[PDB]
Amino acid sequence: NSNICEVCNKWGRLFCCDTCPRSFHEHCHIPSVEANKNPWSCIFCRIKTIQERCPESQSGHQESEVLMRQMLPEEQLKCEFLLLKVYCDSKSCFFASEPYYNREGSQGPQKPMWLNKVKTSLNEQMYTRVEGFVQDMRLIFHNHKEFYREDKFTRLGIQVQDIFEKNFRNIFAIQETS
Ligand SMILES: [Zn+2]
Ligand SMILES: [Zn+2]
Ligand SMILES: [Zn+2]
DSSP states (O other), rough: OOSBTTTOOOOSSSSEESSOOOEETTTSSSSSSOOOOOOOOOHHHHHHHHHHHOGGSSSSSSSHHHTTTOHHHHHHHHHHHHHHHHHTTTGGGGSOOOOOOOOOOOOOOSSSHHHHHHHHHHHOOOOHHHHHHHHHHHHHHHHHHHHTTTSSHHHHHHHHHHHHHHHHHTTTOOOOOO
């Protein structure tokens, strides 16, 4: 197994996957690394099994159909994995915890949102469709862009939204377009 967390790239108290060489801090894995379970398989491995069981699941899909899907166990897992892929980028730190807004010439968003809030919402099964999760994720970057206006810090929202969107298209097998 790797000697660093796959998510945050630090050492520490690491749980090792039994079916791949990745390792995780407990609360870096999503869902949090399960209490017992030997063997234990990471989210990466679980996602790969879904694909292997249903190879046609990789054929192109339309985003509008994906968004309307109910949050059955496989969709739940795919959103947890997509959330994790965002935390994998170090720039996710700026969007992880509850923000506050006090900048001359701007007003804070009407509906603040952050990654740990989406993480709790997934854990508490608060989303009934994929659309719920994707709208809260996109809201994080949209709030950032609007608040920071012409400050160059706006770019951090563009950067981490690009990671989200690439991974959304990969995990949900969105039909490739020009
Ligand atoms: Zn970690
Ligand atoms: Zn694994
Ligand atoms: Zn099949």
